[PDB]
Ligand binder design. Structure first.
Ligand code: MET
Ligand code: NA
Ligand SMILES: [Zn+2]
Length: 434
């Protein structure tokens, strides 16, 4: 019934394909968790579905409609189950509308770097929901194997502002309330949906030209940032050029950061990275930008394969470092020096405590380092382009990665990657052949 994730076995609905979220969120007091919601989901199906089963954790549904007609629905524990008048079959789409209100609940589970979900602190409310927190404020197929496009209308007090993933179009104001509209036009996972409300300011930068492609530039600056919380001029353009030369075209229409005066890890929310100031370093800004490809465009089929996101985002830091004239092998050796004193594991995680551990970041990066040094920078760069293309529109798996390596690069290259994928012991540091 559910997606059947190996880490979170109850999330999502098997065969459900949400294609667009049309969300109208109203945040009456930024900084406090209460909110109300009005969302219409455009859903398709990969198998016949008698019901639409959505994740929701906290708020209470008050009304539901299907294609504009009243429909039978029930809220059970962590799910909203909607019985359709007839099954939704592959090739068809329907519009499920849900009216809800209440307090999002955090899924803060010990073994995760955050309590994921709707965050509320210091006059700000914002989404920081990787892996399974979006269900706190949005009835959603809350699994990265079902990315979707988003249109978000955020209604906030006039004194406040709001920013969400997607290009900002309109802002209207009545009765002391402002409503802002953002359109995320390339599909991204539920947790990749950026949404921040509170005292914040929008700052545009000149367009970035990546050959034919134009990438808009916009950052968010919340009030009360520490001194020296900046995006160095020109850095994001150089990062976009260097990363897109490695991975292929940038997947989105805009990139920037939302700098927050809070103490938290950064999250690669689509086109607008949620960037607490304590994480605002060059290497994190690169990391989060790399994730726009590996995580937001190329999405995970199963939360056990987090290293496909975190390892690839981590290896981009070394590609960026080399691009800036630094020694890549020395950085790889630093990754290894930090893993040599830590427990190691195969790259496929089996427990939630492992999905964001040192192996997912650095053992995955060193896995890519072993592959790159085996096939050469030319072959490696052509494989990263192929990888992004092969898994655009299709969730990626560790198995699918190895098969693509054998396919494209050969059996020897596949076996080089596999020793890093499999095996509990940490392999020796990948070093140039010579
Ligand atoms: C605390 S969850 C954030 C994960 C994100 N991919 C990172 O680089 O830290
Ligand atoms: Na989808
Ligand atoms: Zn990351």
């Amino acid at each position: 019934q559910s997606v059947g994730d190996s880490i979170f076995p109850s999330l999502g609905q098997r065969g459900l394909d949400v294609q667009h979220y049309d969300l109208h969120l109203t945040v009456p007091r930024p900084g406090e968790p209460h909110l109300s919601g009005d969302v219409t989901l455009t859903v398709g199906a990969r198998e016949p579905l008698s019901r639409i089963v959505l994740d929701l954790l906290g708020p209470r549904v008050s009304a539901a409609q299907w294609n504009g007609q009243r429909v039978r629905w029930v809220q059970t524990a962590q799910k909203v189950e909607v019985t359709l008048p007839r099954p939704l079959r592959p090739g068809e789409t329907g519009r499920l509308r849900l009216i809800y209100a209440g307090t999002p609940e955090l899924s803060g589970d010990p073994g995760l770097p955050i309590r994921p979900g709707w965050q509320n602190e210091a006059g700000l409310s914002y989404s920081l929901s990787e892996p399974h927190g979006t269900r706190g404020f949005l009835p959603c197929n809350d699994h990265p194997s079902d990315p979707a496009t988003f249109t978000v209308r955020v209604t906030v007090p006039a004194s406040a502002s709001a920013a969400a993933s997607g290009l900002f179009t309109t802002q209207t104001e009545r009765n002391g309330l402002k409503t802002l509209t953002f359109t995320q036009r390339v599909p991204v996972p539920t947790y990749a949906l950026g949404l921040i409300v509170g005292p914040l300011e929008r700052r545009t930068a000149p367009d970035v030209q990546l050959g034919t492609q134009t990438v808009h530039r916009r950052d968010i600056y919340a009030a009360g940032l520490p001194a020296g919380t900046t995006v160095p001029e020109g850095e994001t353009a150089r990062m976009l050029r260097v990363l897109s030369d490695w991975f292929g075209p940038y997947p989105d229409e805009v990139y920037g950061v939302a700098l927050l005066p809070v103490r938290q890890l950064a999250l690669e929310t689509a086109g607008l990275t949620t960037m607490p100031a304590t994480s605002n370093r060059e290497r994190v800004r690169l990391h989060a930008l790399a994730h726009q490809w590996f995580g937001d465009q190329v999405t995970l089929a199963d939360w056990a394969d987090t290293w496909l996101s975190e390892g690839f985002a981590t290896y981009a830091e070394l590609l960026w470092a080399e691009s800036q004239g630094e020694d890549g092998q020395a950085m790889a050796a630093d990754w290894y020096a930090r893993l040599s004193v830590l427990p190691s594991r195969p790259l496929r995680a089996t427990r939630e405590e492992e999905i964001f551990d040192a192996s997912a970041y650095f053992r995955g990066a060193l896995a890519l380092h072993a592959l790159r040094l085996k096939v050469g920078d030319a072959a490696f760069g052509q494989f990263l382009h192929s990888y992004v293309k092969t898994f655009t529109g299709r969730p990626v798996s560790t198995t699918a990665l190895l098969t693509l390596v054998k396919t494209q690069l050969g059996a020897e290259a596949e076996q080089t990657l596999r020793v890093w994928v499999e095996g509990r012991t940490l392999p020796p540091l990948p070093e140039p052949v010579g």
